[PDB]
Amino acid sequence: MELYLDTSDVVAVKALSRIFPLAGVTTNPSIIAAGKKPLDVVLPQLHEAMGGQGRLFAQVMATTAEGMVNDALKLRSIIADIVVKVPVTAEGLAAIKMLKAEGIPTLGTAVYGAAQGLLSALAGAEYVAPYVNVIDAQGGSGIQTVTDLHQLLKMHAPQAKVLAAGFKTPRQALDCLLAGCESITLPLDVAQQMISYPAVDAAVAKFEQDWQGAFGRTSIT
Amino acid sequence: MELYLDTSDVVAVKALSRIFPLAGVTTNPSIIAAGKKPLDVVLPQLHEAMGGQGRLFAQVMATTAEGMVNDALKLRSIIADIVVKVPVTAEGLAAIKMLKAEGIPTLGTAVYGAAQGLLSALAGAEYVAPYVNVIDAQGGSGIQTVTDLHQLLKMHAPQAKVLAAGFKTPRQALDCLLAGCESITLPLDVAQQMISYPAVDAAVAKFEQDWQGAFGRTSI
Amino acid sequence: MELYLDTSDVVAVKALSRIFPLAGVTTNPSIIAAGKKPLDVVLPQLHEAMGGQGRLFAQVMATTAEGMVNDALKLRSIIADIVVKVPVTAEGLAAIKMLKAEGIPTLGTAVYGAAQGLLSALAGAEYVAPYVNVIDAQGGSGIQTVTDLHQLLKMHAPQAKVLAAGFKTPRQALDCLLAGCESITLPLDVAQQMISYPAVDAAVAKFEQDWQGAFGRTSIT
Amino acid sequence: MELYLDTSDVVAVKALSRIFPLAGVTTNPSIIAAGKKPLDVVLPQLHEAMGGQGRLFAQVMATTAEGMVNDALKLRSIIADIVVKVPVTAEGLAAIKMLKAEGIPTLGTAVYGAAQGLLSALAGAEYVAPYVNVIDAQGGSGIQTVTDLHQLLKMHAPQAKVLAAGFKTPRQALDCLLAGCESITLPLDVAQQMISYPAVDAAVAKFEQDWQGAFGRTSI
Amino acid sequence: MELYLDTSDVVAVKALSRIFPLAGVTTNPSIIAAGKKPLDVVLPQLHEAMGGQGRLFAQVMATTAEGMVNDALKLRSIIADIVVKVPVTAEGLAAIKMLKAEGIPTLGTAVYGAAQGLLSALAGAEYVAPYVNVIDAQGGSGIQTVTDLHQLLKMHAPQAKVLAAGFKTPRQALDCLLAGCESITLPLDVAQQMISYPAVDAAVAKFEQDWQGAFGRTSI
Amino acid sequence: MELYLDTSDVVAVKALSRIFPLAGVTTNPSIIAAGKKPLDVVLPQLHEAMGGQGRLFAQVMATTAEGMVNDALKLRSIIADIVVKVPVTAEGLAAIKMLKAEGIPTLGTAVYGAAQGLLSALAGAEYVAPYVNVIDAQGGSGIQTVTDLHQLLKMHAPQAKVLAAGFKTPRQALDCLLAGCESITLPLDVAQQMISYPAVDAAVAKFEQDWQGAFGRTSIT
Amino acid sequence: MELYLDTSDVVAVKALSRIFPLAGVTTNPSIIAAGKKPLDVVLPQLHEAMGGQGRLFAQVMATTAEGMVNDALKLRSIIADIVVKVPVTAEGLAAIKMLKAEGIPTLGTAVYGAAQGLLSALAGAEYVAPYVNVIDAQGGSGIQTVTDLHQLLKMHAPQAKVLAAGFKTPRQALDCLLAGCESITLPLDVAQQMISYPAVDAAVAKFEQDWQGAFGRTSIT
Amino acid sequence: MELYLDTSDVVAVKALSRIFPLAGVTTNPSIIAAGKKPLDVVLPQLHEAMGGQGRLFAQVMATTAEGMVNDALKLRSIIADIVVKVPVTAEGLAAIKMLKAEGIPTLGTAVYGAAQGLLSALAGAEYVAPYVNVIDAQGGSGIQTVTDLHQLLKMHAPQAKVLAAGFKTPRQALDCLLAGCESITLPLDVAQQMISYPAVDAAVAKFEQDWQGAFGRTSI
Amino acid sequence: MELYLDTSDVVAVKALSRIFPLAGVTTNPSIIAAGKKPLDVVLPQLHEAMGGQGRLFAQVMATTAEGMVNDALKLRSIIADIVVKVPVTAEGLAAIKMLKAEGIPTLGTAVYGAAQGLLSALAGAEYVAPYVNVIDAQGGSGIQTVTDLHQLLKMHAPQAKVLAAGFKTPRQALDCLLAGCESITLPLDVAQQMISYPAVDAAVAKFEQDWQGAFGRTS
């Protein structure tokens, strides 16, 4: 199991790497755009903010296979071991095949369907990222798509893992983990909700009160 | 897992071999007939259009076992490593048994039933091809037949795989893959629908707009 | 239960109305475009080809609610009792609400989601038409969407029916009918496959042979 | 619920009408052909052999709707209240529609699929007869087809009933009855197996022995 | 719901009628034989031992329909409102049909199968009695047979009820009641186990101890 | 079925009342606080923005039953037919009982459990509002709680309905509607996502192109 | 998996051994009686009609264990490697135990119950043959009994296999194979129905017509 | 699987050891009491009646752990390899722990609950014996308890097996075997019912008649 | 499978260690507070009351990770091999990560959610303790949470076990054991109910009566 943060926010990655067991950080174009720092600045910073270990993901922007391969080589010169995210289109699949030949790890992104996702794995991607909340929001079922996709990868492309992406609620992350996803990437608001519960804070308060009212302090000797 | 295109269209095989991870191409008599080129012309062309790698399948035409074995030897002289498709009839099963003895890979085709399909595997076929959409269309369930057939092969003939064939919609291909089929063959219209989605195109458009409105270009 | 043909083909409607128990004919813009005859020509012809009984459906083209209401009034002047098809968008829903006020039957079309479909029913549509094969083809499940939509209509909008639309195989039509759809519309290729079976033809052949080989003819006296 | 015998055997109908609660007798062309007596002879005999009460079913032979309607009028002149069996084809459906207009009860026969069966009900048939064992034998599931068909009739054509037909084993008849079929037609070998059990005969023997060994006879 | 005791033991019927809400008493030949008293003695005694209210059941002994009808008329002259138990055989069904015509309530007994049971209901029986423990013991499932039979009666013969019979354990009686049987008949050993529990006796003991240790007595 | 918007945003209520078939608008303290306008200003504005038809909901602030009853009487003097939202606590239940006696419709809010929710219905509330996303976020299942709550109301308090509240995704609203909720209240971001789909926009575009390429315009005559 | 024919018909065994992959032939007393040829004639003929390869099964007639062991020794002198069919009764089980001691393969036949069948396996039988159609016909479920029996053998007697016997329809054979039976024996009428389908014949006809109407023949060069 | 008889009846053990594949014989206090012969007489007789092969089980009578350990040592001096039955109480568990230390195989008996049964396995028992019919009779479910107990043993104490005990019907024995119990112990009435079926006797009769009517004898 | 008692009651631990196969004893702050004896007194007593064998668990009190690590080192100086219970909060997870680095076994406690519990296992905890009755009582399902948590640990953190905690009834303990928990900790009232049954006592009585009425003694 591989826990990823889904952010370009360097400060928050350094803070949360003390708390969560992070395998790394995932980016997409919208998340880099929101940060307003370009790739040759933010990727090295993100790499340094996890202490120079663990995996980064960034997306190609080009529309053609030849262009997506050049975008990949550009990303690999910024971060030597980066995994190249490639959207799963006709041109996407062709790029994933070429990138397998050159030996550059890829991830099939913008997956809205299990069949689509499996094709990217068979083409050579070692991660496949269905956009859970987007499928959910566009009238379908993100959990069904992730469940189906994980089953397909485990029978037909065992070398590949689902990297479940795009969460508005922790329930979505839990249902993906229960369906068997070997990797997931949390936005910062969902990661926060996953570790801070009112019910737990009340349990800790009561433990302090009971320890106080019996030993006159709230600490150990 | 083995992805096959179900076509005699040489141009489309060359285009799509750049995109899909193809294990090869399947033919039947109707698909060769539609192409209007005979087997000694189209098979070598199809072989060359996937870069000389991966498997071809072509069907015997004869009515008797002895005749189906001769049809097989003719196909093997056109393509040395071709897999012979044999319809699963009384005479079909007898040919599959004879072809196992000679050591020529076969596929049991025109399978409308799980029991029928298993007999072809036990006889020696290493692929079994239920006609999914035809079972579906003729009042039955292609998915139930493929599901049952895959279970039967995995318990009673582990040497054999389902090669699910005959799709009008990508859902049918997905349900066969989810039921565990280790091979499938897509017609060109279904393969196209499986890789091009409006929702994905909109996601890519939005990524370009966001990157534009923050860095002033759409590239790196 | 209401069986509809999904065609502008006047000749085939007259042929098949002798065979199928037709409640009428559904059209969309693409189906009218393929026929190359405009609405004021083809609709009266389609109406005459079912013997001047039964329901017609045709789609508005406008982008605004006010425009969709005018498109509706134009359709009602061609066929007095036509049901107006309205795509289920923001502007679509607003038009359906206005058309309920004026008392013009509407159908919520271009439905890719159960929630979307229910909103069109609550707005006033008395038919809701999920595009079964399109949902199926775009990585989702048409049967799940139709099943969910029918459940929603039966709990929350009992005045409305699912009119399942868009079939590449008869199995899809059967699964919609089994999920409880009170209306369906078949393209001509699927309707043909639903009534002609090789296995049935062989059963009839054998009945003729047995009757021949015992009474010397293939007819009754 | 309506129990039918599926036979032209007049002697066996008279014997079994004493035992089973029969609603009548069903015929098909093959069953009349086997009997070698024509319709104007055997139908009145079958009607008399159930004591002139309950329903008869016989099949049209013609290929066109107009021809199937004439075949129907011929059957109605032999037996005034007969139900006309019509195979569910393009021409079949057209005949069923015409026969509804004239007010002659019909049954949609030779049904190998649920969708097919529902169309015959919507067209006007008040019975629909899926050939259970034939679907079962031709690689499909007769029970699935009957179950689906009954569900379809109850939602979309409540005026119609399934008349399940074609049994090689009593299990098939039980599974159709459990799936909710409001009518069924048994061949003579299956009807016999449904009422005679070794286990029951042993229970009756033991009751006689216990009554003997306590009162010195086996009666009251 | 109708609770019956399955015994000829007059003393035990009078004791248990004070405790259970009895609808009556069922007999079979083996149970009358064990009691060693003949029908014209024991039936009036059993009727009196439930205070002259509620239903009795007794079984015919004859092998032929005409004989089973005479056995029925003999039982009706002993107890005017008795329900005639008839084993479900060829001859059984014919007798049930004749007994419906004469207007004498019957019960189809010695039922080892759901289809068998339904035929007896369609023939006119208003009770059907599958031998639960015997089906269970002879390698099958009494609960499955009772469940199937109850479903069949509720769809196809609503006039009839299952009277589940033959229990070695209270679980069997509970599973029949949960499957929906509107009548059941308990042997004395099972009825006893259904009302006396160690856990309940311990609960009552503890209530007495708590009341003692607070008020100094065990009464009010 | 009763569709509610969950907002104090008067402008957006007037825009969306043209589109959705609204039964009214729900408020809570946090939603009124965000709007920065007090109750005697915003409630009459919200009432006018749905054209003076359909229901409003607002929450009491007090800690005691007697105080919650006074808060209710204050709300009823601002909007004569308002439904009083009461949090389901010890004091909450006591207020709901008193408010039933006086004949003022109430809603049991801040429901994190099915048992809790049923007690508010038995006490006299005619709506019960489980906080779906909050239960989901705090490690539980909002859908399970809503499903259980709806079953409980239908067996044990048939006079009451679930008013499902608090959504981050339209899937959550769909699963509540499928579980049988006879009322729901959508925040503006979820309501928007429920009516606008990329797949539908593409279908409408293609209909315009086909009609263009056959009749030379994109409108009807 | 082991396919057996259930017949004494020597001619039909030789015809069908060309088509089916036969592991051998099963007999019972009724099937030998119908053939009217005694065991010392028909068994060697049946052995020769499958080309002298694969297994034969024949049934003992005796009522006592000592008698069933003698019947076994008589069968083994006709066919050296024959499997002895023993009905599963008190005396049957005792014979199976004795035959295990002497090292003669046995099959527990006339099995109407899963418990009965398991006892024969534990006693030493390496095949157990529930009479599927007879259980089905006598008011029970052959499929349930075979399913239960196969589960029991796989947990409690892994040395043994179900040899499902007695079919009136191919569905019964399919349901036994789907429940996991590692061996089955088909009567000739069921074996025929399992390989000849009208729908397949129509598919082959259409292939010939298409090949004809494009190359002017129905053969390959 | 280990098949056990649940009896002190030496004659019946010798008869049935010829028929059933017995792993041995189980006793309890009530079963020894019914036999009226004490342990030092009946156990060696039972051991000899299965030909001096396979396992015996007998129960301790003492109330305290120290007493149950002495009872165990007494049983081991009568039969060297006997398995000691210990009721699963507070004192029971303590004895099982002590008996594991000394190296004497034990069985946790009088188990009415899955949790109770698991504790006896964790304490060191290598068999756990839920009283199936008693749980069933006292308003609960013996099958549920055995199913749960077997699951618990397989996850949390793999060294231990369920020895299902206490049957009034063969269905109960079958449901325990289907739930996965690796050992079971049958009373004589249930063991008899498990091997003698009327339906099988009729099948054998018919085989004799067919062989007679074709060869003139009933032998080879 | 690892059976734990959930108590600071030294006398009851010594009594019940004769009966149950105990892997050790778990403590929390409230349970130590109720006992009124501090950790440096009660922990060595609890260790001695199970005969110096099997595991002890005690909870940190501090609010910060650095403070929770110091609390851990204090516990390890009282009992060398103790497992440090750590509540699963932001600061909790950070402490669990630091304690994995130093090589001190930890348990993620105060778990009210499956996702929460899995994070503590991924962080390095080798036990995770959902508060079953508290989840049950606060409107949720303890059995669902334990079932989900066990599934998550077995797929994503196989190094870790569920230690199900907080029971008001033996059914709750059974449903956790059936869902596959490889460890559990029983309060004394539930442990007692799990071994003493009226129905069993009646069965033993009847065995004595039958043996009496046939051999004239109860030996």
Side-chain angles (χ1 to χ4, degrees), chain A residues 149-211:
Chain A
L149 172 57
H150 183 251
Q151 283 309 315
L152 292 174
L153 292 198
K154 257 48 260 177
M155 302 188 274
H156 305 312
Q159 319 288 300
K161 317 189 204 215
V162 179
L163 196 162
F167 303 81
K168 288 296 151 210
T169 188
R171 185 77 231 184
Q172 289 174 332
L174 171 66
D175 289 341
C176 297
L177 288 169
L178 284 172
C181 293
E182 292 142 294
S183 65
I184 194 170
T185 197
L186 299 176
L188 297 183
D189 53 2
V190 165
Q192 280 308 143
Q193 283 175 110
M194 210 155 287
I195 57 174
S196 111
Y197 302 84
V200 167
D201 294 342
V204 176
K206 191 58 145 75
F207 285 162
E208 263 135 45
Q209 270 142 53
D210 282 12
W211 192 270

Side-chain angles (χ1 to χ4, degrees), chain A residues 11 16 40 65 109 128 137 179 186 189 215:
Chain A
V11 167
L16 292 188
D40 40 40
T109 204
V128 182
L186 299 176
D189 53 2
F215 303 112

Side-chain angles (χ1 to χ4, degrees), chain E residues 200-213:
Chain E
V200 168
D201 294 341
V204 176
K206 192 58 211 284
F207 285 162
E208 264 132 45
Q209 270 141 53
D210 282 12
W211 192 269
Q212 175 76 46

Side-chain angles (χ1 to χ4, degrees), chain C residues 37-214:
Chain C
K37 309 186 266 157
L39 286 169
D40 39 39
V41 166
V42 72
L43 290 184
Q45 281 179 0
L46 283 177
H47 193 256
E48 196 172 43
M50 326 166 299
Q53 89 84 34
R55 192 172 341 262
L56 277 166
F57 297 81
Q59 203 166 307
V60 306
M61 290 305 305
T63 303
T64 68
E66 289 71 32
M68 287 173 177
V69 176
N70 279 53
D71 279 1
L73 288 173
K74 272 163 205 145
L75 288 172
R76 294 285 280 186
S77 65
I78 301 179
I79 308 294
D81 66 6
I82 199 162
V83 174
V84 181
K85 299 177 100 193
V86 177
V88 179
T89 55
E91 284 307 310
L93 288 168
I96 293 167
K97 301 228 299 156
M98 274 154 202
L99 283 167
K100 174 168 210 173
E102 290 214 55
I104 293 169
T106 64
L107 170 155
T109 204
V111 168
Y112 285 60
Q116 180 192 7
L118 170 58
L119 290 169
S120 82
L122 293 172
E126 83 176 55
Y127 297 90
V128 182
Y131 283 6
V132 173
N133 182 48
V134 179
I135 303 161
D136 257 0
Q138 288 179 23
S141 168
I143 308 306
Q144 195 55 256
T145 298
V146 171
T147 305
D148 290 346
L149 172 56
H150 183 251
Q151 282 307 318
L152 291 174
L153 292 198
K154 257 49 260 176
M155 302 188 277
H156 305 312
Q159 322 286 301
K161 317 190 211 209
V162 180
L163 196 162
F167 302 81
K168 287 298 145 216
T169 189
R171 185 77 230 184
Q172 289 174 332
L174 170 66
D175 289 341
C176 297
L177 288 169
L178 284 172
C181 292
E182 293 142 291
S183 65
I184 194 170
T185 197
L186 299 176
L188 297 186
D189 51 5
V190 164
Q192 280 307 143
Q193 283 175 109
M194 210 157 284
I195 57 176
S196 111
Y197 303 83
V200 168
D201 293 342
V204 176
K206 191 58 146 75
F207 285 163
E208 263 132 48
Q209 270 142 51
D210 282 12
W211 192 269
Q212 175 76 250

